[PDB]
Design a protein around this ligand. Structure first.
Ligand SMILES: CCc1oc2c(F)ccc(F)c2c1C(=O)c1cc(I)c(O)c(I)c1
Ligand SMILES: CCc1oc2c(F)ccc(F)c2c1C(=O)c1cc(I)c(O)c(I)c1
Lengths: 115, 115, 115, 115
């Protein structure tokens, strides 16, 4: 599993379940092409987005639909989505965990990259 | 000043100085049109981006060039940029501070929205 | 003002107002003796805690009463308080801002140390 | 496993390995009594601190030795340690994950609490 996303809720102290996200990859003409999508499970994790062979070098964007998550809890949040943009596999294959910790007016994001 | 951006450095414990950013407004065709830009001051702040009359309701994106900031310090970063995407909404007189706290492999962002 | 504390609310997107805190200095017997205290202003800031002559090198603890803050808003919090423990070190003229960003089940803290 | 701690490094984008921590429990006389201790593994996780039977209701403090972690990487950090203080099991047994994301001048901490 070369790309995994984990989302947590800082209001409830829980995984953020059923959070939709779309992953894009920058094409040679500089447009964002669709790459993969899914939603977080009961553990707040989304696995199985891609494979080692498909996940080539490139610039990737993870767009996490945080607005819909908060609205369903009755909260009108500040952000439209959380966006994570990064170059992947520039020095050979790596495994990436993208994580986001969500509050209505704030989020933190980090990456855990392993060889 | 209806919109201000403040950027801090979590490695050095300091304002993040000379950080470039662009602000975009989402257009009717879902493209991002440039709206304002600048570099943070010695206090890590960027003022004077817009005026009350120009800053109408809509979806805005602040793209902060965090990669160039870390490269200037000789530190390898994860993100291509930090992206803050939000809806501006008219409910009473409001001033928006977008703040970002930067680390090489992580960032936190919040909004301080006041009257 | 050699020491200032700023507290923000990540649920409401606002300064955290009327947040009580105590500052302690570590004594020779490893106990915490009271040093200063106050409540945050409408800007979420607490100024005037100490003076340059009083704020000598040593280990200091800021204990922020985040539990009472969340209880006043009717939101169940995780932490008893937020604790920030640091060493003050003399290397040139330095001013310390301790900042805390609060959510019910999470907090972030940073230091902005300037000349 | 009713109490687990996970520590990540926001500079390197990696687990924080070999981070020492001590857990204390508030006694009836209001002193902090030693409860458990350990260090994080190669995954940045510390498991096996306690058992369901030993982990009774109370106020617990996790003291994470972040200063030694940074010093061994050549970094002189701001904080002496990260302190996480919380009431546990007040409504019956729960499983707690305490997490900390570390930078030299900043850290974020959250909790994931499950029934
Ligand atoms: C994401 C940016 C951020 O991180 C924080 C944190 F981790 C703890 C406390 C904080 F206030 C913040 C903070 C801020 O928004 C911020 C900091 C200062 I100094 C300000 O003067 C203003 I206005 C805003
Ligand atoms: C931005 C997301 C985030 O915030 C953190 C924080 F504030 C403190 C400590 C942290 F580990 C994190 C964290 C994580 O990356 C994370 C949390 C868990 I639980 C995991 O199992 C995995 I894999 C990753």
């Amino acid at each position: 599993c070369p790309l995994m996303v984990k989302v947590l809720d800082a209001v409830r102290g829980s995984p953020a379940i059923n959070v939709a996200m779309h992953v894009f990859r920058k094409a040679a003409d500089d447009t964002w092409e669709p790459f993969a999508s899914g939603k977080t499970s009961e553990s707040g994790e989304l696995h199985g987005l891609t494979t080692e062979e498909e996940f080539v070098e490139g610039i990737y964007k993870v767009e996490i639909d945080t607005k819909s998550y908060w609205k369903a809890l009755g909260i009108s949040p500040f952000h439209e989505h959380a966006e994570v943009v990064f170059t992947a596999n520039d020095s050979g294959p790596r495994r990436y965990t993208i994580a986001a910790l969500l509050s209505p007016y704030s989020y933190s994001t980090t990456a855990v990259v392993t060889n």
